[PDB]
Ligand binder design. Structure first.
Ligand code: N4Z
Length: 312
């Protein structure tokens, strides 16, 4: 006893075992998948009997099976008509990321702010605003320092053309889940027929020796440093100090003051080599009044100070 959804692009079907997983709801996931594919393919919305998406019982195997059958037959008609890899829309991507999470993370957890279990609530929209603001290209290398189950990396890889996206996570439980998130994401993206950039989710300590040169060569760092201690903050600034001009750090708490004024007593501070701006979706956003910080490596701040001493 199972439910099957045929892929709109001819990939392997999505197979769900009945009784469906508890999770959000698995039956609603199947209905929303069908609706998303219908929104995506106008011939499919035409071929599909309208009534089948109004009249359903998620608690009935036969009712759920009939819904899947109607969709599957409509996909078959469309595949017969066509007989004779684009990036996902923002709406579809939100669905795909939630779907990937639901199929990957199965054990209870605590639902703290910006935690994997609440990604859909404020993270998804905020990461979407951030992507629109920093405008990465094929020359960029993106790294999430403390990537959790890899959700930010998956979103950014599905939305941008960076050369590569990396996620590094130290903790055992999220890094293990990231392995399933990776598989589930690649599988589901193929199922929908959607393109994503290259990415790697790995287990590791971003403060290790190996990671020193990796951070130095990164063009865009993403780091939720909100709850970081002074030691991790100090070590990170030491890593950032080796970054290239124009290198960027997107964070939840600033690494240098917004009003940093270089003088003779603060030449050791990271503020001497980076621009820092506070960004806010509120500056059409109706979500939480959130803020984030964009840091840009710029050693001309330090150069202009020495230049001004020699040229009064
Ligand atoms: C407010 O409570 C709070 N906030 C944060 N973090 C936080 C605070 C604020 S603010 C100043 O209060 O407005 C805004 C954004 C974030 N996090 C964002 C984020 C971080 C870095 C760059 C960003 C970004 O968003 C961005 F895309 F724009 O660029 C985030 N982190 C992780 C995954 C997805 C997302 Cl989207 N972390 C914690 N914790 C630490 C974790 N476990 C519980 C306590 N608790």
């Amino acid at each position: 006893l199972e439910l099957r959804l045929k892929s709109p692009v001819g990939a392997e079907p999505a197979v769900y075992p009945w009784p469906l997983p508890v999770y959000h709801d698995a039956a609603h996931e199947i209905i929303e998948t069908i609706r998303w594919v219908c929104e995506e393919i106008p011939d499919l919305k035409l071929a599909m009997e309208n009534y089948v998406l109004i009249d359903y019982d998620t608690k009935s195997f036969e009712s759920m099976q009939r819904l899947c059958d109607k969709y599957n037959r409509a996909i078959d008609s469309i595949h017969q008509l066509w007989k004779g890899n684009t990036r996902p829309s923002t709406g579809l991507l939100r669905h795909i990321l939630q779907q990937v999470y639901n199929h990957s993370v199965t054990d209870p957890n605590n639902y703290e702010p910006f935690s994997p279990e609440v990604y859909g609530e404020t993270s998804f929209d905020l990461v979407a605003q951030m992507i629109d603001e920093i405008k990465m290209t094929d020359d960029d290398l993106f790294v999430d320092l403390g990537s959790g189950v890899g959700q930010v990396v998956l979103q950014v890889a599905a939305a941008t053309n960076c050369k590569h996206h990396y996620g590094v996570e130290k903790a055992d439980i999220p890094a293990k889940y990231a392995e399933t998130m990776d598989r589930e994401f690649r599988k589901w993206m193929k199922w929908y027929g959607k393109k994503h950039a290259e990415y790697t989710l790995e287990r590791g300590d971003f403060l290790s020796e190996e990671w020193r040169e990796r951070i130095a060569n990164t063009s865009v760092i993403f780091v939720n440093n909100f709850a970081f201690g002074p030691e991790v903050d100090h070590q990170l600034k030491e890593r950032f100090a080796n970054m290239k001009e124009g290198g960027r750090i997107v964070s939840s708490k600033p690494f240098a003051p917004l009003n940093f004024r270089i003088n003779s007593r603060n030449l050791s501070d990271i503020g001497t080599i980076m621009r820092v701006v506070e960004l806010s979706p509120l500056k059409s956003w109706t979500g939480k009044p959130v803020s984030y910080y964009l840091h840009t490596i710029d050693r001309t701040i330090l150069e202009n100070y020495f230049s001004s001493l020699k040229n009064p």
